[PDB]
Amino acid sequence: GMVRPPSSIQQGNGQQFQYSQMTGRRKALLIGINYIGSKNALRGCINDAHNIFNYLTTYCGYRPEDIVMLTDDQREMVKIPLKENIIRAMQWLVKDAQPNDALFFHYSGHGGQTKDLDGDEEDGMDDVIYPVDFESVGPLIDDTMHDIMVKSLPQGARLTALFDSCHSGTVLDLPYTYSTKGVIKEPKFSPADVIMLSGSKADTFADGQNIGAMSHAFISVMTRQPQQSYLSLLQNLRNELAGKYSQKPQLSASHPIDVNLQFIM
Ligand SMILES: [Mg+2]
Ligand SMILES: [Mg+2]
Ligand SMILES: [Mg+2]
């Protein structure tokens, strides 16, 4: 059998944190932006969000009324991934979060860094996503995403964030990153259970071909073999991406992870 994550509060590296048991509420926010008709148009991001929608509702018990999907092919304004709609949807996603909830966030679109002009550090950069209206309202930055989606969460609430944009863990101010090689990044800590999956690589605008590889690989890995440890998830993602893309899978987290534990969805 598998080893499920422990249910007691954990101490690790001067941090208290709790793994989600994934027995709580299942809500998801899925964002696919093709920037349709613009010079930064992409072709597959909306499809990426639909593919994650189908995976979550078919295999993970998510109900359609519990998923907000924002894609820019929509004629209804409230379904468009405008910055203000993304912010309101991120607030919806975490409202009411409890320990053991299973919240899901997916972003497929452009990503990069912008100068952190108020940041009390020269050459300091914000890590950002690009809402469809970014040419008129700017990006949505790490600080905001972290403040809405992470800082709010109770101990033991899961947020599983899947980025198709090749962000690093800095996009959600996560202190830990794991690869198939082990710990590749480690240290205001959260006790929640925030994990992030993303590929290693204003940096997507000329490299749009690596966008979308992670959700495709994730769905493929999890469909072929639903039983995964965090270790095998990263190995199987690595195997799924190795030829077709240069990006490598990276698991970022708000807390240390014993990779031998089961990765529960
Ligand atoms: Mg700033
Ligand atoms: Mg930052
Ligand atoms: Mg694609």
Numbering used by the authors: 73 to 259, 310 to 323, 329 to 392
Article passage:
A second preparation of CgMCA-I at maturation day 4, concentrated to 8.2 mg mL−1 in 10 mM HEPES pH 7.6, 150 mM NaCl, 10 mM CaCl2 led to crystal growth of CgMCA-IMg complexed with Mg2+ in 0.2 M Mg Acetate, 20% (w/v) PEG 3350. Regarding the specificities CgMCA-IMg, and as opposed to CgMCA-ICa, no β-strand complementation was present to stabilize the dimer which instead shows contacts between helix 1 and loop CgL2. As opposed to CgMCA-ICa, residues Gly84 to Gln87 show clear electron density and form a hairpin stabilized by two short β-strands (βa and βb). A disordered CgL7 loop is still observed, but the segment from Asp330 to Gly335 could be constructed. The electron density map revealed the presence of three magnesium ions being hexa-coordinated. One of the Mg2+ ions is positioned at the very same place as the samarium ion observed in the crystal structure of TbMCA-Ib but instead of being coordinated by four amino-acid residues and a water molecule as observed for this latter, in CgMCA-IMg it is coordinated by five water molecules and Asp214 (Asp189 in TbMCA-Ib). A second magnesium ion coordinated by two acidic residues (namely Asp188 and Asp190) and three water molecules is present in the “calcium capping loop” contributing to its stabilization and reorientation. Interestingly, in the presence of Mg2+ the distance between the two catalytic residues is 10.6 Å, against 8.3 Å when in presence of Ca2+, suggesting that the presence of calcium forces the catalytic site to adopt a proper organization for its autolysis activity.
Metacaspases are caspase-like homologs which undergo a complex maturation process involving multiple intra-chain cleavages resulting in a composite enzyme made of a p10 and a p20 domain. Their proteolytic activity involving a cysteine-histidine catalytic dyad, show peptide bond cleavage specificity in the C-terminal to lysine and arginine, with both maturation- and catalytic processes being calcium-dependent. Here, we present the structure of a metacaspase from the yeast Candida glabrata, CgMCA-I, in complex with a unique calcium along with a structure in which three magnesium ions are bound. The monomers CgMCA-ICa and CgMCA-IMg both contain a p20 and a p10 domain forming a caspase-like core in which a two-stranded anti-parallel β-sheet from the p10 domain completes a six stranded parallel β-sheet in the p20 domain.
